[PDB]
């Protein structure tokens, strides 16, 4: 396993074939006419996929050359999944084309670093070009079109996403889960909801199937397990003379207090619903106070000078209707001031980002969307778990793409905007001839992905691409119909965020990787 | 784990040959003339079995290509076995036909996605046709006939299962168990049953053979053990006043209490029997109130401040008869509310939709059978464990077939319905001629299971297929009669669900496999 | 692991090779001229054997093919040993011949199902005919004859066994084990007895070996720890005033109890025999209850609602005489009525007829014999350890054969019943030609064991069989002396149960030969 070193093109040629390897591993799956690849599973059955990165993630070759090349190209695709997950094939093909043009330039003895300088300043110019070319994406028709593009002519899933997103609002949170039957299940859970079950089964309410409902109850917060005191009776009798149902949130209730608390609810005196703590202590308590403010309750924590039994009856929060089952507790609409809710939203706006990013951001965004609106749940069903996941990954990709389109809009899809801005920026000049040829190299390498896209349909890339370059504006080529026309007719519009981020990150990684000159390796 | 990358036709033929070897190894079991397969077992004697997936689950190939193919294809067979368990050979054969046709089409340059669409539409049409042509099966004669064919022309088993299902009612539970004698014996156990014996052997009552029986007793349920709870002395006096026997359900009883009780019973003071709770804490908590509802009593709860010491006369469950042996207790005509029985049944109906599925179904249907259905025990009597395996396997095949037929309805067996629906659906056309070609080729090749069924009998598949294509209606060939006639005459009926699931799963999996264009392996 | 599949001719050839292995392994042991086999043992001495299962159960060969063939044929031999244990060589040979002929027929293209049904019908008809021709024999002369037939010209052992069985009665059993003296020793003592050594050696009276014999003692059996209590002063003083010797069976003895008891011994006031509890708690308790019933005492312990320090002197039983050895104890006669005998034997008998069988029933006959008869003890002694093992195996085979013959009855032994049933059942007919072919093949193969016997004897097998087929009744051939003659004169008779079980096992192995079509192995 001793280290061995080589220099320049002799090693680079090895890289090429490995690149070549990974390259044709990916580009076979591009386009509507592109096919799938099944990935061996060490534990169970192999899984079908169309995304190049899903294929490549586990891929490494026997020899050190190709193995390290695959790892060093796989990082950008990993980041692409970290952000969006699609367009990975484009990043791979552009990387291959640019590294080939890089070896061509090195054959001229040309400086890689000034090449990178010219190329990435041209990339920034293209960023500005794309920002200028951005158009708003507002109509749900375009949303359905882009989802259908992402979902392989699946009008059902895309349209379903459309009404779900519309009725939950643009800031409403939407989640996709498993289903077994041939039909997806659409659920909306609005207000406040948590997944905790009643400790006592005797809470079976008047509605059949054990369905539990409370109209305008009094919600209360506690931090103690009520065992030693065993006397909530002052509060109980205050609610009894109030004569209205109640919900309690506490550490726990001991069986001794539980007996009368359930026995007394039967008696019909006060209906009381007791639940376990939904989540981890500090943050869960923090969101319970937000719920209390939402429900018109007061900030109540037993870990401060105030007492459970020492309080004012108005401290109990009220919500119009609460629905409780064996596992799920939900509120339809509560009694709270929207000014205070929006103040809490402003308070939590900066916490939306924080610095933890991955763990904190999505959790907090879904939680706050629940705090303001509701969550959408879509049970995507299919015959086999591999089929479910194969559709699923496209579902989350389309979800993220819809988020990008909502936040930023779209640009002319099908790569025509790319080639037009490249043609317009062909006039760009650098410090010297090195930067100029670097810009031209970047242009000619960007030409290749579109040509491969055309080739994916079993049609000639050259003259078709030339015809694409001939027209402008709405004129573009559709692979599904394999014909030219408007973007609106073809619905091929590129979400701005995914294209911008993927293209620029791929450009950066390519510019830094073409700088290879020396090789270290291990022996068998 | 070094990886190797392969393209196109080579992997295609590898997958072809592996699937073909597995399939024609399976084919030796198809039809009445099919035989068994012997599988080497390291621990002891080999396993001899007919159903294909039973063989498949342990199949592992020396070659990585074929190993990947076998493991990727076994999922459909495994889940089909999980669904029904028989006809799996037919599903495998038709799947192989689909693979052959798909690879042949792709060899022509076929579009994989067009094939996917075509096979999907064909499956939709076939499912609708099966729904349309499905006919109900109600008469016990036809039930016995389908059991007989499902038991490999065993009429004795058919009459046995028909008698069992009749006496266990429509919602009874039927199970097959190991038998001691040289022949099968079927027993019917009805009423409230559980497997718990009397605490002491001296509990043997008046009935001989060491049996412990009480006529018109009362039933006590103790939430916890007996330490000082033997203070039911007042209730005892009432029982002493009533001159009635008693039954005890308690966690545990003191040795002094056990000794004092035994003496009381043998002295004739009060004659009482005691048995333990049937199952786990959750199970017993759920089913004790079910027992009470059957016997019209009130469960003594340690969770509520009602106990044995403070109790009512009718808190004892009321039943007409109790019969207890060394480890089993039976209750005859418990005196309880039938409407409460329906309420508990409806609660069970709501609880039907459960992720636990079969593990939940055991007790879920156990309670219903104890209330309304019945218990059937099929003790398989024979010498060799392989023979019990074979007869048992035929037993659950017949059981599943009968259950599915009763709940669902039937179609003609032997694939006559398959060829009929293929002929009727030959008229459907899709979006593209590519899709139409996929559909029509699927129709051409879907008769292959019938071809192999004929072949297993050592008879010309081509002659029979041509003659059947000439014939119409329920006319068809039977191997048991080894001649033609009416398919109904022999009473070979297929549940629609098994055929539908097999066809849809085979089409889905085949469509996903054929789209693969790249291969990856690891070397030894 | 890597699997390799064999089909049809090749798999059948491997089965034939396993058959050849089995045949050469077994043939060496058929008849008087079929000789013993030495069993290699790296641990200890290689062991000489003749029983077919004894030769078989430990034999496994390297080549996987015949290895799994042997593994799958081991089950029939194992089951036969667990059922009868003798005639295993004969049943194995007949089954092997049947299998060989069936494999030949399948090589001719035989139908598995025709074989299945024809062999089932033939087995059923042969069982019926064998039952019809069954002649029970009860004379001790015939019992000695058949025991010697099993013992291969051992007369004294057969006479001893017959006398022992007669003296132990119809329900009394016989125990056989190794001996030191080269002559077998038979010891039978009637009544109640179990082996138990006294904790205090000073229980030795004037007679030797600590044997004490006492008149009408006060027999007490206690399942409770008597060490803790000691005391018993009122009862001890009552017995002392009565003037009779003292008998106690205690769980344990205290140092104080030891002290007062040894003071009693060396002081010479009262002779007291104290013994520890016999064995395993619950079952020892049950058999102690049996002893108390047979002695006319009362079952008294803390498991009974009697009091320790308060008791009545008549509560204990009295015996005609009690004898105690160094490590065993017997009672010559006790207070036991035949009605209580019937009741206890019946409540034991119901447990005897159960599915537990092994590891529980033998103790059941032990206890029952202690209730009614006595234990028969056999000491077989000789020179070399391997030869004692062989003699023990042969003697136990004879023991089981005698038990089966006594409980069931016999037919003509030496295999002549086989030829006679084959002759009389030449008229059997099946459903079709193939069934009749299979039946006739089985009938022809029925001749194999006897012709193999004659071949081993060095005489013309087929002509001797033909000559036997000419006569009828009990006239046939003698292999020990090797000449014709009547069976009755030399009494070659065999219990019918082993014959029927062999036929049933043959039916099962035939039913598992018919499906031999595909086999799977694992090669490195």
Swiss-Prot record, chains A, B, C:
GO biological process: chaperone cofactor-dependent protein refolding; protein folding; protein refolding; response to heat; response to radiation; virion assembly
Localization per Swiss-Prot or TrEMBL: Cytoplasm
Sites bearing N6-acetyllysine, chain numbering: 116
Annotated positions of the N6-succinyllysine modification: 33, 50, 116, 276, 320, 389
Post-translational modification: Phosphorylated reversibly during heat shock. Can be UMPylated on a tyrosine residue by SelO/YdiU, probably under stress conditions.
SUPFAM superfamilies, A to Z: GroEL apical domain-like, GroEL equatorial domain-like, GroEL-intermediate domain like
Keyword tags: Acetylation, ATP-binding, Chaperone, Cytoplasm, Isomerase, Nucleotide-binding
Primary location group: cytoplasm
Regulation: During the substrate-folding cycle, the two GroEL rings separate for effective substrate binding and chaperonin activity. Ring separation is triggered by ATP binding to the trans ring of the asymmetric GroEL:GroES complex and avoids formation of functionally impaired symmetric GroEL:GroES2 complexes. Activity of the GroEL-GroES chaperonin complex requires Mg-ATP. UMPylation of the chaperone by SelO/YdiU negatively regulates its activity, and may facilitate survival under stress conditions.
EC category: isomerase
InterPro entries, per database record: Chaperonin_Cpn60_CS, Cpn60/GroEL, Cpn60/GroEL/TCP-1, GroEL-like_apical_dom_sf, GROEL-like_equatorial_sf, TCP-1-like_intermed_sf
Cellular component GO terms held in the UniProt record: cytosol; GroEL-GroES complex; membrane
Residues the entry annotates as binding ATP: 29-32, 50, 86-90, 414, 478-480, 494
GO molecular function: ATP binding; ATP hydrolysis activity; ATP-dependent protein folding chaperone; identical protein binding; isomerase activity; magnesium ion binding; unfolded protein binding
Complexes and interactors: Forms a cylinder of 14 subunits composed of two heptameric rings stacked back-to-back. Interacts with the co-chaperonin GroES. Can form asymmetrical complexes, composed of one GroEL and one GroES, and symmetrical complexes, formed between one GroEL and two GroES oligomers. The asymmetrical complex is the functional unit. It was suggested that the symmetric heterooligomer may represent a transient intermediate in the chaperonin protein folding cycle.
Purpose of the protein: Together with its co-chaperonin GroES, plays an essential role in assisting protein folding. The GroEL-GroES system forms a nano-cage that allows encapsulation of the non-native substrate proteins and provides a physical environment optimized to promote and accelerate protein folding, probably by preventing aggregation and by entropically destabilizing folding intermediates. Also plays a role in coupling between replication of the F plasmid and cell division of the cell.
Family: Belongs to the chaperonin (HSP60) family.
Domain notes: Each subunit is composed of an apical domain that binds non-folded proteins and GroES, an intermediate domain and an equatorial domain that binds ATP and is involved in inter-ring interactions. Forms a large central channel that appears to traverse the entire length of the cylinder with no obstruction. The central channel of GroEL functions as two cavities, one in each ring, that are separated from each other by the crystallographically disordered 23-amino-acid C-terminal segments of the seven subunits. The entry and exit of polypeptide seem to be restricted to the apical end of each ring. Modulating the volume of the GroEL central cavity affects folding speed in accordance with confinement theory. Small proteins fold more rapidly as the size of the cage is gradually reduced to a point where restriction in space slows folding dramatically. For larger proteins, either expanding or reducing cage volume decelerate folding. A stepwise reduction in cage size results in a gradual loss of cell viability.
PANTHER family noted in UniProt: 60 KDA HEAT SHOCK PROTEIN, MITOCHONDRIAL
The protein's name: Chaperonin GroEL
Organism name: Escherichia coli (strain K12)
Protein encoded by which gene: groEL
